[PDB]
Amino acid sequence: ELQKLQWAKQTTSICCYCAVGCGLIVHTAKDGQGRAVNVEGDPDHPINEGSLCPKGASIFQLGENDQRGTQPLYRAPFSDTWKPVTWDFALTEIAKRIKKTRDASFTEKNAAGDLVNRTEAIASFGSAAMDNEECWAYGNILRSLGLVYIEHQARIXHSPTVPALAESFGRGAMTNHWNDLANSDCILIMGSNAAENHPIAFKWVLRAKDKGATLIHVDPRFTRTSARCDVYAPIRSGADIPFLGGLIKYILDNKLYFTDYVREYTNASLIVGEKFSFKDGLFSGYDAANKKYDKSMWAFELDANGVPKRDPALKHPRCVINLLKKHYERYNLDKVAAITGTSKEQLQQVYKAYAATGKPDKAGTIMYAMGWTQHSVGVQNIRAMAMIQLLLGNIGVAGGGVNALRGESNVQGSTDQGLLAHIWPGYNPVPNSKAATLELYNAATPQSKDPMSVNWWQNRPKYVASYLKALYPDEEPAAAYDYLPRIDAGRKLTDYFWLNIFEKMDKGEFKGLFAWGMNPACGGANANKNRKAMGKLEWLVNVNLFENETSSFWKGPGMNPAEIGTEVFFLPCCVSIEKEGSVANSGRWMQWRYRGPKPYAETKPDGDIMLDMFKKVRELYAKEGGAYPAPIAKLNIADWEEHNEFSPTKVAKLMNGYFLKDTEVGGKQFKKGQQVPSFAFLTADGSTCSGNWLHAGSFTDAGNLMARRDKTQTPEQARIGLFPNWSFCWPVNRRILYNRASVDKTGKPWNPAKAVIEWKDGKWVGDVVDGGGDPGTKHPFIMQTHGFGALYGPGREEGPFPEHYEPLECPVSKNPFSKQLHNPVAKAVCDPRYPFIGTTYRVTEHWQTGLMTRRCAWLVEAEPQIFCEISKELAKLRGIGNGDTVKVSSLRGALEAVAIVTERIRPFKIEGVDVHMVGLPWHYGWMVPKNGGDTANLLTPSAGDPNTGIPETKAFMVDVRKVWSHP
Template sequence: YILENELYQKEYVLHYTNATFVLNPNYKFEKGLFAGFDPKNRKYDKSKWAFQLDADGKPKRDMTLKDPLCVFNQLKKHYSRYSLKTVSDVTGTSEADLLAVYKAFTVTGKPDKAGTILYAMGWTQHTIGVQIIRTMSIVQLLLGNIGMAGGGVNALRGESNVQGSTDHALLFHIWPGYLGVPSAKAQKLEDVLKRRPQSKDPVSLNWWQNEPKYIVSFLKAIFGEKATAENEFGYPWMPKLEEGKNYSWLDLFDDMYKGSIKGLLAWGMNPACSGANANKTRKALANLDWLINVNLFDNETGSFWKGPGMKPSEIGTEVFMLPACVSVEKEGSITNSGRWVQWRYAGPKPLGNSRPDGDIILELGLKLKEIYQKEGGVFPDPILNLKWDYMSQGLYDPHKVAKIINGTFVKTVKIGDKEYKAGSQVPSFAFLQADGSTACGNWIYSGCYPDAGNMAARRKTTDAINQIGLYPEFAWAWPVNRRILYNRASVDLKGQPFDAKRWVIKWEGGKWIGDIPDGPAPPLADADGKPNPNGKHPFIMTLHGMGQLFGPGLNDGPFPEHYEAMECPIEKNPLSDQLHSPTVPMYTSAADQFAATCDPKYPYVCSTYRVSEHWQTGLMTRPQPWLLELQPQVFVEMSEELAKLKNIQNGERVIVSTVRGSLEATAIVTKRFKPMNIAGTIVYPIGLPYNYGWRWPVSGSEESANLLTASTGDSNTRIPETKTFMANVSKK
């Protein structure tokens, strides 16, 4: 719709995206598959998606947008199949409603307009979850909404610190600051320091070329004085990823189910209820030698061995419970979805024997160091050399951790014309070095705790000069207190804002004013329109400095493409011959079952979600009688039409089942759910909250909706597909 009606922001698309890049002639898309697909290994050869390069090694560009192989024309060709009728058939949304949404949002493609897209887990928990979000980023790039005030694609998180935990490497494939964990093939540090491709385009800032500084500084933070140039700053002591091996949630529990993992620290989690295919997860826990449950209360994970269907006498898992205190009882920071790092102080004292997470992990680490010191081991070096001095007066000190995350000069160095003493704080990541003179736990947080103090604790409400609600002295935002990422894309080539009323930055008097600019370079053109030789493209974290309409790095394709869920109610994909994503992860254990497409035993599309009265799997809320009273039971929502078809009354107890498991739920017959016409088939949706488990309420009859979901997920992130699966509902 945007392309056909030329509603895109032309100047933005032409100069700030890779729309003009010319693709390799090998690139194609046929019958639902991109070029380079290997059906045996179910993987793509991404070299088939490369750009053509000129004599200087830069991507060839067609500024006229006439070359049929340029990204812009390939984008138009790819989505020409997505007519209003076809999208209506796929989604069940009427053409009139689709058109109303299209018209309302595409007005933001005008230079002085902006629009944001907010999404939650309804998008991510699919086998094509990443590509759904990619679709929205393409929409926003076409409309010129990235880098603008009121623009972007913004996540609505279910936890206050999802951003912070990801920044600090909650996920297996990254070190803090999104530094990729090396593979086992990279045995030498120099292999890692040279891994980033270099852009041959002098106008590309390609910020990842600075990664060696961040990696070496991170290693210095981990191993302190033990990390030296002679021992590659401790790089040999760091874990590596086995080539081709995935360590995501689904894969870990698959290995656990097969018996190849012997121990688990379940830290602030409840996998017996929160993970897809919970029956498989619970059986996997029974194969462990030991399980450490760190949480506020006992839960279905810590007590899995006495849960439904379990035989305690046959389970050898030894379970340890370490009671942790709640967030308001401890000091530290959180980072919200806007990347604001906010310091929070401890309120009441922890109850009973519960302790802050920091104290628990710090003591555990010290004990491990003590044991390795006494007894040695196969490879004690990583533990013995670990820098682990984050106590004050015998307790964990979050300020010490925050300071090393910020970064410290470990040697006196001179940068420019200024000397920085050993022991002083690094002002920002621009001062980090690759020679071992700086230590930094997370480069993107560098600047949050400089010598001037804890920036995250600031609470001033004075706005910036542009008066658009940036509040630069309230808390601190990574990186370098920049409030809007890619903000140099909010201005034209001369550095003047597209939206003069809500400007983010602008070039004035030979400098940027407003927000902290995303990269220090001047505008791409001078005031007279002539190219500025010092100007840089605005998307500094991409190789070529451009917003990526064509994204050749993902596992399942450079353009988003629609595929049906692994369990679906229609036999044919309305858009291609390929029904499911060809790269979707598949697990082959006896517990990994899927209903056949259009299986009459499981005719209804089921989804899972949350209720406001309970928090995640309900561990913090189900033990509270006043909250449990508000939402005491698992329920299944269904349309009036389906209830009539099944002769189910509102409030009646029913059985919801899939090929993987079943549970009892209370029927809620509601106008909220409606039958949907999907490609000519009437489909009845149903839905359940996943906030429950057998531990509370004490009846044991209110179980997790994840007993129903499947062990499959997105091929990039492995986020499980818990939003779409086929189920049945029947009278009890």
């Protein structure tokens, strides 16, 4: 017997850090009644098989940590000290702050006199770190309170590129999953440092290489990933579109595209209208005065039924694929090599290796995470990857996909639950002012006349109805619809997002901010400006594990508590291993985890905090009345609780959904109270509730499918690692999205050795088929209006084909592909005192702003201080030695760091000038540890991308100078 574990209860959990979703085993003393005594990997988990990176591996030290919050703290206006206070006080005083601000700022109708039923004087940030049930509850609390300014993590790294995947494939999600990487024949890692940022991914990447795969890293820097790839190709910052356009030209010129796949399953055959043209860097329909396109100029030619016309022969000159060939002929190897700084020889090596996966018996995957995609053409960068994958037949297949790697453990879930301004849960849009009835709301959903187009979003009215019946089960949906707030139809959508929230705060336009599981004082670009702006709040509720740069901005560097009127409530929540719930990983695996030890001290699960905070607002409205009470008073919170506590199990069953009465649906009888077995059996007429249509199937009458720990696989499942009985993935346990594209029109796999699905004996065998229907009777992209993988994507603001427009403003003057230098539908100062391209990135050992990992002594041990990575060339130029202290400055601020001089950074050759990149981690903050240094976001601009509404954290101009020592 091991003494350490002898009398400890073993429970399972899921890592609280990155979206790999590694399994943990937790040992809790006194058979569960004590503290954690051990946390390590779960040997039985199919993704990590017991392995953990230093973050997962140090969760014992995060949990059992004497620096954690113990109870609510209170900071009174102008006060220079915290005041320890009760939960009853804190949640009573906050309930009063909410109601006061709401009553004082509720608008029942906008200037145009349209029903909006909203507050604009409260914002909320967070959080991808919360459980799926807590995310869903939290959003519904904020909306019942009438908030519209509801944002989180996803906006920063994911929202800028998600449209690329929705336009191309019909969904925004990672197409495949982590185990599936082992089936790839060629892995292109581009805008990802996965060995550092998704480390257990490399179990599966290196297993692909074991079976013959070529691993390719395309990155401005040589990283821990690069060290373990066959091919490291340097690219200068922002040259990705040229790189990918060259590969498109290469695939097309050499006929390396998979014709039968392209002809049947992409929109290659669709006839684009005569009004479509491209000249001089501009598509047709350009309004030069307003810098925006009339996208109707890009419309397909339609047949008598309104269905886009097709030439299956692919000969018609206005076939998408012939227009694609014409568009990419400019992207020759010499121009691409010159602008990327990649050698022509290395371009041909990579192009040849990757385009070889066009053959049906080979699969290629692209892995990207954030990289540099936050800028206005990031979405076109990902569009190009999606197009390359559709040409090579790599969508829907094992070892294929666009593996858009999620960041936070539950950023997939937190997006799924609608913690962004523009979406309800299930990706049903937040209504605008003109959507004055539920009928009008539902009319906006596009229809198809093509009988082979599943066009599944036509089912939306069932999901909206069932979601209203989950919040308000005694109300008719049409009445419930009026309870939820609306954004102004007239207003630019990005006015409701992350960056405008900061801009408004700094104009004094918010009374209240929830900083719920986020560290905006460190995570937001231009920290000096945001730390000042937080002063202009009246009150701030910060819910986190530790005291931090956000909770305590008022006593941060250069601050004077006396002068700062913001009332701060710090509410300590419990770590992942101290609560029950689910997190949805990057592959959409919704994974149930259990409490090990009880919450530390008086800490609480987010669920209890938010439910108690709301219950107090409710009763405080029931006894004083005030602005529009109906939403608050009628919100169904009964279903969220058991034993006077937030119930993960009951919230998860509501999110799945149940029959509110006896219903016949899809030719089947269902009894009242029964769980909805699948979104296929939801109704629009009030027979069903469901908090989230994507969750219908996750928690059935068979039980909690998220909680399944079953490694049972058929030979064909096991061959590609589907693990269909291990937890559950939306939608309805389809592990590989778009898998109908993996078979021919008879239902036979293109690649039998790596079959995903196969038509045997009148059924689909393997994965769950992504769309019902006999072989050859449906288009394979069932969430697309038209049903095809879009090579030509006319919904995109910048055009239907990716085109190089220079993201790097300051050092670049020439676009070799057109006369259009910058994005024509999107001003940096480029002050010559700041000649260097600053960038920020992660290291394996730290998490996000470091709020969590700067409290972990083993992670501080490995990576104790902010550093500055620079080339030997920039070192030599600035007289900087390895280990020297340096000052990094921008127009926005300045900080000190330890110089790391390394050949892992080389100069970029731009128009015959060496341009120098400077690298910093954004993991450091003034609060901890001693001598750790401060946020790299002191240096970054807020300015923000006109399109994505996200500032620049990957290419911002700095200077670096040696800070002098005593001789």
